Each structure stands twice: as structure tokens, then as C-alpha cells.
Design a protein around this ligand. Structure first.
Ligand SMILES: CC(=O)N[C@@H]1[C@@H](O)[C@H](O[C@@H]2O[C@H](CO)[C@@H](O[C@@H]3O[C@H](CO)[C@@H](O[C@@H]4O[C@H](CO)[C@@H](O[C@@H]5O[C@H](CO)[C@@H](O[C@@H]6O[C@H](CO)[C@@H](O)[C@H](O)[C@H]6NC(C)=O)[C@H](O)[C@H]5NC(C)=O)[C@H](O)[C@H]4NC(C)=O)[C@H](O)[C@H]3NC(C)=O)[C@H](O)[C@H]2NC(C)=O)[C@@H](CO)O[C@H]1O
Length: 567
């Protein structure tokens, strides 16, 4: 019977260990900042200053032996490796020929990126978000944006998680050609160059490591010694609260799509696919991958890129190859991984891909049924309408008609139904299509009554420019405004219209607007009525469900209407 081991807390790093090393006080290349280990190196020191020390020690985690070795004096260091994250009751046992003596149990922490070491996240959700009993098989998705923690002041704990099945995290960049990033400003290109130092072209990185894993959030109990912080640690804690929730990294987006055009070369796809596998092993809270390429065939941020012959086949091959890779992860982990993509729904984007071929490898297509009209020009229209609006010309809807100059339309009008129908026409199953809802408006100014051909329809007018305003009103970029801003500053309590704005609805299109006759300010968006129509439409067609961009811009009204529409 030797003296029972006494744990040296200071010599054992306060029993805090981690499978991941993350730089917290510096910024450099991704591979320099992030180091993942399949096995955590555990080092525990114990003391036996009185009595006999014995010959042998045994280390137990919840009664199960994880280590053993020799005792050669009053003080002993137990060094071993362990690969499962979590919290364990550790006891250390000292043995000789006459018996064994155990230490009192103490908790050891082994951090991993599945959040297994973390307590479920405490939520701080706007109570305007209601509770629903929506069928869990129905997709209810949204995008959470990395940069939303700054000016937008929208954090992971703000998300109405119980009203979501899928959280898509925007955006993960790909190292390589990224000239489109420069349009963002705010030093975004430089930040990407820094992340990509020591990273091969066509491999993924984290754009903003401060937001991702460095920033200390007090609502998540982050402190100096916390091995993982930022959005990622909060998403890990969220997975602990909501284990059935799917959190998926979205690769690309409008400004980060440039590298995709080089996927015509399989070697570049190979590099990318391998990088994603590494990324999903490193960040275990993620449940698959979302590919947001805008767009195969061109028409995206980079005017000089797009290959209508080869992009579609590359996209299909990418999905096939990603699915093979995800199958490997499934075999290695016993988990189920999802493969998704957000796609343009303009006829001229859909036609460049055989989605029937692509979708056989995929769980969901997030149909981006918004941005049909906007401040990029001075032509008003419904940005996210289900159907063709009253403002449209004879035969414009189907595309068989003629425009103002007598020129034929080149394809069906930009509407949600036109896009969905085109996808179904390719042979895409309805139950893999997710319909897009807008949590923001697009807007113009100078659409004054004198510009209108139909005096009661501002969609028949002409603009002088983009909607302007302050970030207080949800205008983060000219021509774009948060739904919650529209509600607070244009709609008011009961859609009455405030501050010079009147409310209108196109029952043919299923699309709302607000219009200020004096300023000519006009905003197209989704509201309770239009979202109800989208939900009713989705269940009628047997679609997979609904998704939205972006949750920080909602006040609860849009996601509520999403659930009520699917009820
Ligand atoms: C039918 C048809 O074909 N119509 C065409 C139409 O499609 C075209 O318009 C484009 O449509 C597509 C959809 O098909 C849009 O792309 C998708 O939809 C959403 C919403 O539109 C996209 O969301 C944008 O995402 C970008 C990133 O890609 C966001 O950019 C961010 O901007 C903010 C500033 O607001 C930056 O914040 C700064 O961040 C730094 C830190 O980095 C911080 O320090 C600063 O404080 C902070 N500043 C501020 C002011 O907050 C941020 O860095 C940056 N992020 C990045 C990574 O670049 C942008 O805000 C989002 N816009 C809106 C609106 O929310 C999304 O990319 C994409 N979704 C998916 C799922 O992929 C596309 O946006 C749209 N383009 C345009 C130009 O509007 C049009 C025009 O070509 O043609 C029609 O024919």
C-alpha cells in the first residue's frame, strides 16, 4: 500500500490539453497558425512526498486505464497520448507488491474541434423568433457570415437555432487567383494573401482567423488559456446544444469564386478535394461541404472568366470527386456527411450545368432565388418574386416575347418559379431543391411617379441610382438593405408604411415593395406574405424546404414566415 498519488496541477498544465494548436496573438499563414494532431500529448505530474512511492503507476479516465509506467521517486511525470476529446474523471494509481492506492478523481480536459470538451452554448435569441413544430425532415437553412461579428454585431448565440436544420457558414476562400476580392476593400485581399502564405494554390484557408477562432466571446466563457475561441468555438458549443443541427462550410461566394474557373484541370480539383478532407478532419463540428461557385460558364464577379464548354463538366466532376472523398470520411468516422451547392437560378446560369448529372452525388441544391433585379442598373423589378410581375412585357415571362427595342428576349424572365422549373426540366428531383428566401431588400432612388408607365406600379418606373443610407438603417452597401432595417424604418408596426414610404404587393408575382413617392426610393424584398407563398409553393412541388440569406439581417419575421409557410 504505497502513498496515494497527489496531482501537481501546475505541473500538469491545470489538466488542460488540446488536439489543436491555434495561434491567438499573431496572424500568419494557415498552416503556420493551425496545427491539428490526431493524438493529444498528455503530460500529468504527481507527487508522493510522504511514505512510500511504490513501483508502478496507472492512469484512469472514467475507470478505464489509459496509461502506465514506473515510479522512481517522490515526484513522477506521466506522459502519454490520447485521441478522444472530452471531459474525463482522472484517477492516478500507485502500486507495489503489497497493493495499490488511488488519487481522488479530478477532471481532465482534452479539447477537440467537435466541441466534446465544451458545455452546450447559451443562446441569446431575439424573442420575436417564435417556436414551431416543423417536420425535422424539411430543410430550414440559413447563412451565417464570418464578418457579421463586426459592424453587424451578430454572433453565433444570436441564431434561432431551434428554427434551423442547416447553418451555412460564409465564406471559406480558396488560395490562388482572387482579383474579385479587391472589390471588398477593408484590406480583405491582403488578409487572404497572408492566410495563403505557405499554402498551395487551390487549397482552402480561413479568411479571418480573428473572427474564426481567436476572438474571445464572454457569452461562451472564453479566457486567455481557452484553446479554441471565436465563431468556431461557439459553433462547436452549438453542436453540443443541438446535435442534429447541420453546420456546413460554404466555399466561395460572389467575391471568392475566381479559383473555381481553374477546376477544368483535374489536378487542381485533386488539390482542392484533398484540402477539404484535411479541413473537415481539422474542424470536426462541420458536417460536409457547400460549394458556392458563381458561376460555371461566367457572369460572376470576374468578367474575364467563364468557360461554357468546360465549367459544367468540371462542376459535375468536382461533385463526384467530393462525394468519393466524403465517403472516405464516412468510412473513417461512422458519421454522415452532406454535399451541397448554392447555385444561380437565371436561365443563363442554369443552362451551363447538367444538374441531373451533378445532383446524383449531392444532398441538396440551394437555389438562389433572389437578386433577380437590383441596383447594378436602374431597372426596377422584383428581386425575389415567385412569379412574373405585372411590370413585365407581353411574352417576357416565358421569353417568347419582344423587348422595348423590338429585340427578342433570350430566355425566360428572372423569377423563382422560372428557375425551379428549369432545374426540374433538367431532371433534378424536387426533393433535393431548396427554395431561397431573401432576408434583405435591394433598392433604388429616383423612381419618381413621373417615370412610371403604370401610375400604381413603381416597377414600371426608372431609377436615377442605388438606395443610399446608414448602417443604422441596415444599409451596409448602396442598393442593399437588411429586412430588419426595412421593417424598422420603412414598414413600421403593421405594414402601414412610415417616413414617406408606402407598402405595396404584386399578387401576380407574390412580391412586396416599399416606395417613397417624394424621394423615388424603392425597395424590393421578401415579407411575411411572400414567404408564406414561397412555403406553400415549396410543399405543393415537394421541394426539400427553404433557405435564406443572411440570418443577421432578419428580425425573426422572415424565419417565422418560413416555418408558417411550410406548416
Ligand atoms: C438571376 C441572375 O442571374 N441575376 C444576376 C445576379 O445574380 C447578380 O447579382 C449577384 O447575385 C448573386 C446570387 O446569384 C449574389 O451572390 C449570392 O447572394 C448573396 C446576396 O446577394 C451574396 O452575399 C454577398 O456576399 C459577399 C461575399 O461574397 C458579401 O461581401 C461582404 O461585404 C461586406 C460589406 O457589406 C464586407 O464586410 C466587411 O468585412 C470586413 C472584414 O472582412 C470588416 O472589417 C468590415 O467592417 C465590413 N464592412 C462592412 C460595411 O460591413 C465583407 O468583407 C464581404 N465579405 C466577403 C467575403 O467578400 C456581401 O455583403 C453579400 N451581399 C449581400 C447582399 O448580402 C453571396 O456572395 C452569394 N451567396 C451564396 C450562397 O453564394 C451576388 O452577391 C450578386 N452580386 C451583386 C453584385 O449584387 C447581378 C449582378 O452581377 O446580375 C444579375 O443578372
Amino acid at each position: 500500500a504505497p502513498t496515494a498519488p497527489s496531482i501537481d496541477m501546475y505541473g500538469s498544465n491545470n489538466l488542460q490539453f488540446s488536439k489543436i494548436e491555434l495561434a491567438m496573438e499573431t496572424t500568419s499563414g494557415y498552416n503556420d497558425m493551425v496545427k491539428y494532431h490526431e493524438l493529444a500529448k498528455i503530460k500529468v505530474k504527481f507527487n508522493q512526498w510522504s511514505g512510500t512511492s511504490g513501483d508502478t503507476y496507472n492512469v484512469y479516465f472514467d475507470g478505464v486505464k489509459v496509461a502506465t509506467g514506473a515510479i522512481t521517486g517522490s515526484q513522477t511525470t506521466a506522459s502519454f497520448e490520447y485521441g478522444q476529446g472530452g471531459l474525463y474523471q482522472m484517477e492516478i494509481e500507485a502500486c507495489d507488491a503489497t497493493g495499490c492506492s488511488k488519487s481522488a478523481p479530478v477532471e481532465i480536459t482534452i479539447a477537440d474541434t467537435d466541441g466534446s470538451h465544451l458545455k452546450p452554448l447559451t443562446m441569446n435569441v431575439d424573442p420575436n423568433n417564435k417556436s414551431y413544430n416543423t417536420d425535422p425532415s424539411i430543410v430550414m437553412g440559413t447563412y451565417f457570415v464570418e464578418w457579421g461579428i463586426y459592424g453587424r454585431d451578430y454572433t453565433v448565440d444570436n441564431m434561432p437555432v431551434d428554427n434551423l436544420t442547416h447553418i451555412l457558414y460564409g465564406f471559406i476562400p480558396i488560395c490562388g487567383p482572387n482579383e474579385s476580392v479587391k472589390s471588398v476593400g477593408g484590406n480583405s485581399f491582403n488578409a487572404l494573401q497572408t492566410a495563403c502564405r505557405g499554402v498551395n494554390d487551390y487549397e482552402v484557408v480561413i479568411h479571418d482567423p480573428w473572427a474564426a477562432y481567436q476572438k474571445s466571446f464572454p457569452q461562451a466563457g472564453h479566457e486567455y488559456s481557452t484553446p479554441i475561441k471565436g465563431n468556431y468555438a461557439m459553433l462547436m458549443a452549438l453542436k453540443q446544444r443541438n446535435p442534429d443541427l447541420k453546420i456546413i462550410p460554404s466555399i466561395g461566394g460572389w467575391t471568392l469564386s475566381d479559383p473555381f474557373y481553374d477546376f477544368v484541370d483535374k489536378k487542381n480539383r485533386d488539390t482542392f478535394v484533398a484540402s477539404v478532407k484535411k479541413f473537415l478532419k481539422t474542424w470536426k463540428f462541420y458536417d460536409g461541404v457547400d460549394i458556392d461557385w458563381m458561376f460555371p460558364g461566367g457572369g460572376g464577379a470576374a468578367a474575364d472568366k467563364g468557360d461554357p464548354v468546360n465549367d459544367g463538366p468540371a462542376y459535375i466532376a468536382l461533385m463526384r470527386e467530393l462525394r468519393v472523398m466524403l465517403d472516405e470520411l464516412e468510412a473513417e468516422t461512422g458519421r454522415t456527411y452532406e454535399l451541397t451547392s448554392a447555385i444561380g437560378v437565371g436561365y443563363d446560369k442554369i443552362e451551363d450545368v447538367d444538374y441531373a448529372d451533378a445532383v446524383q452525388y449531392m444532398d441538396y441544391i440551394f437555389a438562389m432565388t433572389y437578386d433577380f433585379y437590383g441596383g447594378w442598373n436602374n431597372v426596377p423589378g422584383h428581386q425575389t418574386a415567385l412569379y412574373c410581375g405585372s411590370f413585365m412585357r407581353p411574352g417576357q415571362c416565358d421569353g417568347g416575347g419582344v423587348d422595348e427595342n423590338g429585340e427578342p428576349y433570350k430566355g425566360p424572365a428572372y423569377t423563382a418559379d422560372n428557375g425551379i422549373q428549369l432545374l426540374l426540366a433538367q431532371g433534378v428531383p424536387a426533393n433535393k431543391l431548396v427554395l431561397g428566401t431573401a432576408m434583405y431588400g435591394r433598392g433604388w432612388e429616383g423612381v419618381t411617379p413621373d417615370t412610371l408607365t403604370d401610375p400604381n406600379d413603381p416597377m414600371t418606373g426608372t431609377a436615377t441610382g442605388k438606395l443610399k443610407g446608414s448602417t443604422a438603417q441596415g444599409v451596409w452597401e448602396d442598393g442593399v438593405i437588411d429586412y430588419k432595417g426595412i421593417k424598422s424604418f420603412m414598414l413600421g408596426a403593421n405594414n402601414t408604411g412610415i417616413n414617406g414610404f408606402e407598402y405595396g404587393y404584386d399578387a401576380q408575382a407574390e412580391a412586396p415593395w416599399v416606395w417613397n413617392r417624394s424621394t423615388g426610393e424603392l425597395i424590393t424584398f421578401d415579407d411575411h406574405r411572400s414567404v408564406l407563398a414561397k412555403g406553400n409553393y415549396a410543399k405543393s412541388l415537394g421541394l426539400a424546404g427553404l433557405f435564406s440569406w443572411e440570418i443577421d439581417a432578419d428580425n425573426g419575421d422572415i424565419l417565422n414566415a418560413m416555418h408558417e409557410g411550410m406548416a
